[PDB]
Ligand binder design. Structure first.
Ligand SMILES: [Mg+2]
Length: 239
């Protein structure tokens, strides 16, 4: 059924884009423990069991598979952003191409942001550069493995949701940079890409997001489509 398989992130009480400064130490601990518990199980439908035998080549994805990956991720994040009254994100050919350029240029041997790769991709896609800095990428490393460069669609969707849960509710050892970035107001676009050597215990998920103020003045912006799934609360309130 639709509800048992619904992959929406369950928000804890007192959640906000800046809970790390709004809440006390004791309330932060309680929020994070609650939220990680309430999101530990990847919600699975019979469609998801079949996705376990859909194998994706992370360095060979089709245009449709790239768009699916970005839409899946943007739906989950937009569900949280809409609850917090933040701007909703689009997926476009522009956001996908930018993300996959970052992935292609990123050093597969490197665990941290590849700022040279991000700025090179930015310049070629008409975005502003920030030499030595990264204001485009949230990176998840070590959430999955590539066998001959391949990984199931199920595994990628499972890893992406776990990555978002960890960035929204367990980001304190990284100073909440990912919490703040994923929930930054005024963002309008997201793309998701993947990188890694064929046989890697360290392939990556690149979440690329921005607003139109990151484009150079002359650069063409693509509105694309706002990714929106029905919320669990909307679905429950229908019944
Ligand atoms: Mg990161």
């Amino acid at each position: 059924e639709e509800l048992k398989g619904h992959k929406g992130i369950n928000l804890p009480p007192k959640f906000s884009a800046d809970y790390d400064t709004k809440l006390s130490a004791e309330e932060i601990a309680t929020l994070e423990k609650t939220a990680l518990e309430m999101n530990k199980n990847f919600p699975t439908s019979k469609e998801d069991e079949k996705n376990k035998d859909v194998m994706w080549d992370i360095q060979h994805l089709s245009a449709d598979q790239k768009k699916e990956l970005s839409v899946y991720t943007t739906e989950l994040l937009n569900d949280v952003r809409k609850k917090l009254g933040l701007s909703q994100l689009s997926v476009s050919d522009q956001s996908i191409k930018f993300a996959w350029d970052i992935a292609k240029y990123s050093d597969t041997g490197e665990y941290m942001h590849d700022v040279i790769a991000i700025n090179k991709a930015a310049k070629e896609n008409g975005f502003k550069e920030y030499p030595g800095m990264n204001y485009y990428e949230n990176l998840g490393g070590g959430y999955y493995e590539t066998e001959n460069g391949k990984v199931s669609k199920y595994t990628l969707q499972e890893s992406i949701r776990k990555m978002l849960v960890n960035m929204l509710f367990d980001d304190g050892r990284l100073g909440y940079s990912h919490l703040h970035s994923l929930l930054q107001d005024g963002k309008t676009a997201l793309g998701v890409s993947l990188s890694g050597e064929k046989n890697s215990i360290s392939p990556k998920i690149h979440i690329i997001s921005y607003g139109k103020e990151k484009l150079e003045d002359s650069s063409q912006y693509q509105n694309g489509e706002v990714a929106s799934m029905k919320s669990k609360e909307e679905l429950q309130q229908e019944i």
